[PDB]
Amino acid sequence: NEPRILTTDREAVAVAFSPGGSLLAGGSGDKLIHVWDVASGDELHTLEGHTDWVRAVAFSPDGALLASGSDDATVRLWDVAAAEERAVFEGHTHYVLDIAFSPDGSMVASGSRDGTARLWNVATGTEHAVLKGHTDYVYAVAFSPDGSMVASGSRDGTIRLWDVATGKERDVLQAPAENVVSLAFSPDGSMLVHGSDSTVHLWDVASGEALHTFEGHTDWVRAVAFSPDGALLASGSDDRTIRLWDVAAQEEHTTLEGHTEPVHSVAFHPEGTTLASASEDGTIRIWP
Amino acid sequence: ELNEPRILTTDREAVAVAFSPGGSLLAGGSGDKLIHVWDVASGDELHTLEGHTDWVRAVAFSPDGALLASGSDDATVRLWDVAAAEERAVFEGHTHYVLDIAFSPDGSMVASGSRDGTARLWNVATGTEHAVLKGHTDYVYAVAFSPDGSMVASGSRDGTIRLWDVATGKERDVLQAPAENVVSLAFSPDGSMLVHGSDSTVHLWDVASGEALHTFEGHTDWVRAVAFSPDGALLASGSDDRTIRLWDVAAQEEHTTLEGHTEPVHSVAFHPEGTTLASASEDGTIRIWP
Amino acid sequence: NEPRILTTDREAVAVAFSPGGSLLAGGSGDKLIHVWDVASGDELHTLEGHTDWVRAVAFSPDGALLASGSDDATVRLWDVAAAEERAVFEGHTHYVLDIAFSPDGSMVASGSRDGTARLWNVATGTEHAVLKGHTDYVYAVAFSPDGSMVASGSRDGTIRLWDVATGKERDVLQAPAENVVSLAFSPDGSMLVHGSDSTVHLWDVASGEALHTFEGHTDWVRAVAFSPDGALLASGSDDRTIRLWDVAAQEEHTTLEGHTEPVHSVAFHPEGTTLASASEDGTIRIWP
Amino acid sequence: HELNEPRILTTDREAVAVAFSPGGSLLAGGSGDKLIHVWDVASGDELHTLEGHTDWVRAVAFSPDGALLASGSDDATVRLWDVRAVFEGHTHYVLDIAFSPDGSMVASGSRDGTARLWNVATGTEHAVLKGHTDYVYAVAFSPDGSMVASGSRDGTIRLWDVATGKERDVLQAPAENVVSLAFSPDGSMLVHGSDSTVHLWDVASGEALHTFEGHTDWVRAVAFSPDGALLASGSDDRTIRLWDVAAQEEHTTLEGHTEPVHSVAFHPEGTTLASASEDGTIRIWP
Amino acid sequence: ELNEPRILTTDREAVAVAFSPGGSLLAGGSGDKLIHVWDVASGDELHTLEGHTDWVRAVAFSPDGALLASGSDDATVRLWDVAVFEGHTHYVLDIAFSPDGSMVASGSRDGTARLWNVATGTEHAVLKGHTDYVYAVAFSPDGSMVASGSRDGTIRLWDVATGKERDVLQAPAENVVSLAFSPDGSMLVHGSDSTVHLWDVASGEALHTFEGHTDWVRAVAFSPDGALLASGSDDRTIRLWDVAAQEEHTTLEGHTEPVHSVAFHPEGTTLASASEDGTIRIWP
């Protein structure tokens, strides 16, 4: 079926649902974060303060805060209700390309072009750790659902796993011949998925071995997201499509067409009924 | 960030640095027998304090910013009027090189660490003689008051850090673990932790319990200076490996490596606002970074 | 409540209370600074040495020193008890129109018609920084209560925020239809007020956003001051009045009438029960 | 009569300069709102508003042909308006402008303590008048064009030989700032308006003819009658006073009250007077 | 037992001194980073050798008198014509030419004694076994053995031909700071933070411990005849002892200063002391 559309003046490169499902946050190239009421499709208050493109957004698990990463090299925290900048994190030397909120709510992770992943302490507003190892841009970061581990995806063709507590690297998953552009954990923590150029890979987390490769995209896969029950996987690509795959059977489920430009971010509704995609065509689409 | 805003050029060994309490001035101790005071904003050289006969190994501002103290290989500690309008006293009594000095938070006393194995607590306002603390058969390289002024810590060649109660001159605890000479020490603003710089390593201690909390590894040669950030988040180290490092206290991670220097880094110091740190090196430069 | 009145032989353009509350300094067109014992109403000393109008005055936080700015292009430091000139600062090329003493007591700020804001190190007597950003005259300077920041108000329609230590500009607030003629921080440090033509504007410091505009004045607002508890705002204007505003309610509190000429400066007693104004009518008035 | 005729409005700030056109039919108002207004003396029309200045306009003057107007502003420019302006500059704020009777020259009084003299056609600065130790608040050419007179905050009235840039006389007597100046149509006398009170000076002898007392506050404005018989004073006391130039006695007092009178100008036939006041009113009286 | 001249120019601690083999020239290594050479007969300043970047802790002449070696904190050993360089990973604190003149031994802060062939410039022998900085080295007069003093509190004897440790002399409570080999090769001297010890080479036992100094003993030198031993201390005395007896022979008062280094004239007529002030002194 056909989605709904929301419109931004500029490229929408990041999207996320509030934990309750009632709000939708959109990160854009107008240097703002837009917040929509999902039911009415009305645009609530905007979040301004970033000085460059907003590349990623994520809600706190309690839904009270929103974290954002930007090309201005900063990570900001926003009070959702008040639509206010609550904090600003500095340290990254280059564009911040991804962020993730810990399931705990106490930490934000960021990935940047400076070749590091950083962890920020939400309560104190300080840097908890800098994660060093990658030799190229870090395009994606994601927390393990138990909150103990963070995974980082880099252009150096590696996926690195670190202990959140100590900042220590635990594993390196090799993905050769490729730039890892996106990462996501399954909600059960058993699987990890990464987006590459035209391809989506599945990994068994306990083993660090590759389970399967999903073929069908014809361009860079910049966004991946697991459904809340882990059964479905969504991918966003430069080929303009969004693809759904059946995780257990490891086949194509369906292809979502409609975007006229690259899809930079994909996010499931917490109930699993809806998917949101953001595209360079300046639209956010909600698909059931 | 770790980027550097400015560079100062001195042309000799810059072995000690400290910021004024307001943040606007910088004192530099040099291999010349001189102390320099710089304006941080303009980078202008305000004044040069002469009198020492040998290397100046440590410098400190009084908490009220009116006085500078300097410790030297000539075996003296000198007190300078910052305005420069007035010469001041000199502290004599140490039999060997003085490698460290620290002001008590009230500005009434100064502590000094010498190679003679003694830590001396001198009176600033008063002209009387001072208390002697004895270091354990080995030279004392480093000294620091706790922020509350109740504790003084000393770093020695015995590979231990010593804590005294300032009021009674009583030795409260002994911190052991370093495999070598402890060259620097710094209290957390909380007063809860202590930071140790030694031969290759940076240690974190729980002051109350006298236990080691962590060891920071990453320097490849002797760590000559340490500094605790005002927020307590970060730690700064200077080393003979020619780098300076910033460490995340919680995780013990290399928040940043500052790679401008070509020669050993003898001293590091945080700005009072915690935004920038200054590093001093044998390459005859002072580098300021955020 | 009718105030009490002191006189100067010429225009009184500046006033400030000692931190203890017992003294009142008045800057005038006599080229002198007058000091009054508030309780007795007696004139304790005359500070002489300026060569032109004295435009602004400020006490050191310990009350031992007074700073003054003048049309002679100089900033002077006075020993109050001794009534002696202690230092003279030179460097500004044009009239100095405002001065401020930091809470730290280590730095004096000045704003001049030469388009620059200067910071002077009181202990050493040196020029610490020249702040250059503005493209027109600087009419006001104020320190943040934490002493980390200094703000400058200019004819170029900008308010600028600088780091005191490094002299680096941090922010530029835009107020474009307006010449910024006066500034004050709230004692909290959370808000800033600026005075323009007919209006007093309130800013949120952290967000740099405009909170309110206080309307009622019918001419230039040359002086603004927060009450020590932050609850009240005072404005001095060319319309000859002083207005008090309730900060939280954003409403008019009262209008102080009596002055027969423009009110150039206002200052609160540290207890908050009394206010002093200075006027071109050659009077300083103390109002409860 | 002293009847108040049209009250002229639209300026939104202090009106600090007024002048009649030489032909009598137009009225120019300079204000603190940074503009110059031109009015039809008959009321029937509103004419133009001259915009460009960035700061207070303190003086206006018409060229003797009535085709050009000059203005002085705090923005430090002297602008000649075609009635786009042409511009002239001052190191400091410019407070007074006067055209020579000839119309060949514009004199500008400034905060830099000097009077500038420009050749209108060329635009070339010809002479700088140096001598005052403070702001120059008012300037006027003698009817023969050979002399300029100036009032300053230094409390003096000065006479200059224009061609030679040379100071010829310094008239002293005011205790305070001289705020306005006027030259007599016969050129024999000069009028001072000050922070104390109005004075008359003999041009040839460089002596005081008289002191006019009556005002109870600052005198900001003075203007001679076209026949030279009378003098008008404007004050902070809110009266306009008329004095006999010969006898030196007060003739009449006009109570145009509630407002300080900042500028006054007589009509060319002498029947009318214009006053400027605060807050942007221009008043016309016979 | 007097003393004649005092020698000047060094701006810092003079921590090494050596006479040329044949007469006549004197070398001073200092904290000011340079090596001074002095003409002994005239008491003049012949030359200053510059290049080192850090403190110079040892100097030694080649047996032909044509080359001088220096050890510095800059981690170089340099050979000077009377320059060539060698490296160490750490600070070099001491050097000694073999009596043959074919080898330079260098003791470093890397816990090893380094041995180079001078003519080829190639390092061949590394002596390992010390657990801390090596502060002093000296060849046996036959060149078959090297002795080393370390901060580990030991004196070691090594067989030169095979980089193997032959003996470990223990006893000193603290850092050994200097060592010397007697001309007959029978006795070895240790200078430490408290005392000076004599080690019997054939027996591998301690002949005796010298207890007169009241502070650290920084230097030891054997007389050319082997009869007498000089000790230099922080207490500002130089002490002469009978090697056989081990009894104190004399005390030289310098006083104001701590003696950092001592050396005998090759004829045995003169003794040179180096001090912190940046003075060199000769006594008979």
The answer to whether B42 contacts chain C (CB < 8 Å) is: yes
Shortest distance between the Cα of B240 and any Cα of chain A, in A, equals: 23
Peptide-bond breaks in chain A following residues (C–N over 2.5 A): none
H or E element in which residue A278 lies: strand A275-279
Number of residues assigned to chain C:
288
Closest chain C residue to the Cα of A85, Cα to Cα: C207
D192 half-sphere exposure, CB direction, 13 A CA radius: 37
Long-range CB contacts (within 8 A, 24+) of E35-43: E35/E59, E35/E68, E35/E70, E35/E80, E36/E9, E36/E10, E36/E280, E37/E68, E37/E82, E38/E7, E38/E280, E40/E265, E40/E270, E40/E282, E43/E5, E43/E7
B174 half-sphere exposure, CB direction, 13 A CA radius: 8
**Rounded CA gap, D112 and D128, in Å?**
11
Q: Using a threshold of 3 CB pairs under 8 A, tell whether chains D and B touch.
A: no
**Rounded CA gap, B113 and B132, in Å?**
10
Neighbours of E28 (CB within 10 A): 28
**Rounded CA gap, E194 and E47, in Å?**
36
Q: Tell me the C-alpha to C-alpha distance, in Å, between residue B288 and each of A47, A130, B19, B25, C106.
A: 34, 21, 11, 12, 22
List Cβ neighbours of C195 (8 Å cut-off, separation of 6 or more): C140, C180, C181, C182, C183, C220, C221, C222, C223, C224, C235
Interface with B, mutate which of A116, A122, A126 (most B CBs under 10 A): A126
| Residue linked to tokens 């003149």 | E101
Q: Looking at beta carbons, which residues of chain C come within 8 Å of B26?
A: none
The residue among A118, A30, A136 whose CA lies nearest residue A74 is A118
Do B287 and B34 touch, CB atoms closer than 8 A? no
Question: Is residue E201 situated within a structural domain?
Answer: yes
Number of residues assigned to chain E:
284
Kindly determine whether residue B2 and residue A166, on different chains, have CB atoms separated by under 8 Å. no
The residue among C68, C31, C67 whose CA lies nearest residue C52 is C31
Interface with C, mutate which of A45, A50, A78, A84 (most C CBs under 10 A): A84
* Residue E33: both structure tokens together: 């980073």
Kindly determine whether residue B65 and residue C165, on different chains, have CB atoms separated by under 8 Å. no
DSSP state of B166: T
Neighbours of C280 (CB within 10 A): 18
| Residue linked to tokens 């109930």 | A271
Do C136 and C165 touch, CB atoms closer than 8 A? no
Residue A143 sits at the vertex; the CA angle it makes with A75 and A132, to the nearest 5 degrees, is 65
The answer to whether B251 contacts chain A (CB < 8 Å) is: yes
Closest chain A residue to the Cα of B1, Cα to Cα: A91
State chain A's maximal CA–CA distance in angstroms. Answer: 46
Q: Which of B41, B42, B65 sits opposite C123 (nearest CB)?
A: B65
- Structurally, how many domains does chain A consist of? 1
**Rounded CA gap, C233 and C229, in Å?**
10
Shortest distance between the Cα of A155 and any Cα of chain B, in A, equals: 22
| Residue linked to tokens 């006075």 | C78
Question: Is residue B91 situated within a structural domain?
Answer: yes
The answer to whether B7 contacts chain C (CB < 8 Å) is: no
Closest chain C residue to the Cα of A48, Cα to Cα: C207
Kindly determine whether residue B255 and residue A130, on different chains, have CB atoms separated by under 8 Å. yes
**Rounded CA gap, B26 and B19, in Å?**
5
Do D58 and D35 touch, CB atoms closer than 8 A? no
Kindly determine whether residue C148 and residue B273, on different chains, have CB atoms separated by under 8 Å. yes
Number of residues assigned to chain D:
286
State the Cα torsion D255-D258-D264-D267 to the nearest 10°.
-60
Q: Tell me the C-alpha to C-alpha distance, in Å, between residue B186 and each of B62, B225, C171.
A: 16, 9, 34
Q: Using a threshold of 3 CB pairs under 8 A, tell whether chains E and A touch.
A: no
Interface with A, mutate which of B4, B216, B231, B248 (most A CBs under 10 A): B248
Question: Is residue E261 situated within a structural domain?
Answer: yes
Q: Domain holding B79: CATH number?
A: 2.130.10.10
Kindly determine whether residue B250 and residue A91, on different chains, have CB atoms separated by under 8 Å. no
Residue C11, classed as helix, strand or coil, is coil
Q: Residue D219 is which amino acid?
A: V
Do A144 and A185 touch, CB atoms closer than 8 A? yes
List Cβ neighbours of A247 (8 Å cut-off, separation of 6 or more): A186, A191, A202, A226, A230, A231, A232, A233
Experimental approach taken: X-ray
Question: Is residue D276 situated within a structural domain?
Answer: no
| Residue linked to tokens 């919680």 | B250
Q: Residue D237 is which amino acid?
A: D
Do A54 and A47 touch, CB atoms closer than 8 A? no
Q: Looking at beta carbons, which residues of chain C come within 8 Å of A49?
A: 207
Q: Tell me the C-alpha to C-alpha distance, in Å, between residue D39 and each of D7, D19, D43, D150.
A: 11, 10, 8, 28
**Rounded CA gap, E150 and B278, in Å?**
37
Peptide-bond breaks in chain C following residues (C–N over 2.5 A): none
**Rounded CA gap, D9 and D284, in Å?**
11
The answer to whether B215 contacts chain A (CB < 8 Å) is: no
Question: Is residue D281 situated within a structural domain?
Answer: no
Q: Looking at beta carbons, which residues of chain B come within 8 Å of A128?
A: 248, 250-251
Do C96 and C110 touch, CB atoms closer than 8 A? yes
**Rounded CA gap, C154 and C135, in Å?**
8
A266 half-sphere exposure, CB direction, 13 A CA radius: 32
The residue among D101, D104, D119, D247 whose CA lies nearest residue D183 is D101
What do you get for the CA distance between the two ends of chain B, in Å? 6
* Residue A5: both structure tokens together: 């559309």
* Residue-number span of the structural domain to which B283 is assigned: 6-289
**Rounded CA gap, E174 and E190, in Å?**
11
Do D282 and D28 touch, CB atoms closer than 8 A? no
Residue B177 sits at the vertex; the CA angle it makes with B173 and B183, to the nearest 5 degrees, is 85
Q: Residue E24 is which amino acid?
A: S
Is the backbone of residue D10 left (phi > 0), alpha (psi -120 to 50) or beta?
left
Cis-peptide, bond into residue E24, ω within 30° of zero: yes
The residue among D97, D84, D13, D6 whose CA lies nearest residue D50 is D84
**Rounded CA gap, E165 and E155, in Å?**
11
DSSP state of E92: E
Q: Using a threshold of 3 CB pairs under 8 A, tell whether chains B and C touch.
A: yes
**Rounded CA gap, C286 and C29, in Å?**
19
Q: Using a threshold of 3 CB pairs under 8 A, tell whether chains D and E touch.
A: no
Neighbours of C51 (CB within 10 A): 10
C-alpha torsion sign, points E167, E173, E178, E180: negative
The answer to whether B252 contacts chain A (CB < 8 Å) is: yes
How far is C-alpha E175 from the chain's CA centre? 15
Shortest distance between the Cα of A89 and any Cα of chain B, in A, equals: 10
A165 half-sphere exposure, CB direction, 13 A CA radius: 4
Per the DSSP assignment, residues forming a β-bridge with E196 are E191, E210
Question: Is residue D282 situated within a structural domain?
Answer: no
Resolution attained, angstroms: 2.6
Q: Tell me the C-alpha to C-alpha distance, in Å, between residue B86 and each of B49, B78, B80, B107.
A: 11, 13, 8, 18
Neighbours of B88 (CB within 10 A): 12
Question: Is residue B117 situated within a structural domain?
Answer: yes
Shortest distance between the Cα of C217 and any Cα of chain B, in A, equals: 39
Residues 56-115 of C with CB under 8 A from B: 104, 106-107
Question: Is residue D11 situated within a structural domain?
Answer: no
Q: Residue B255 is which amino acid?
A: H
The residue among C144, C236, C140, C245 whose CA lies nearest residue C185 is C144
Q: Tell me the C-alpha to C-alpha distance, in Å, between residue C47 and each of C59, C76, E255.
A: 13, 10, 62
Kindly determine whether residue B254 and residue A124, on different chains, have CB atoms separated by under 8 Å. no
The answer to whether C123 contacts chain A (CB < 8 Å) is: no
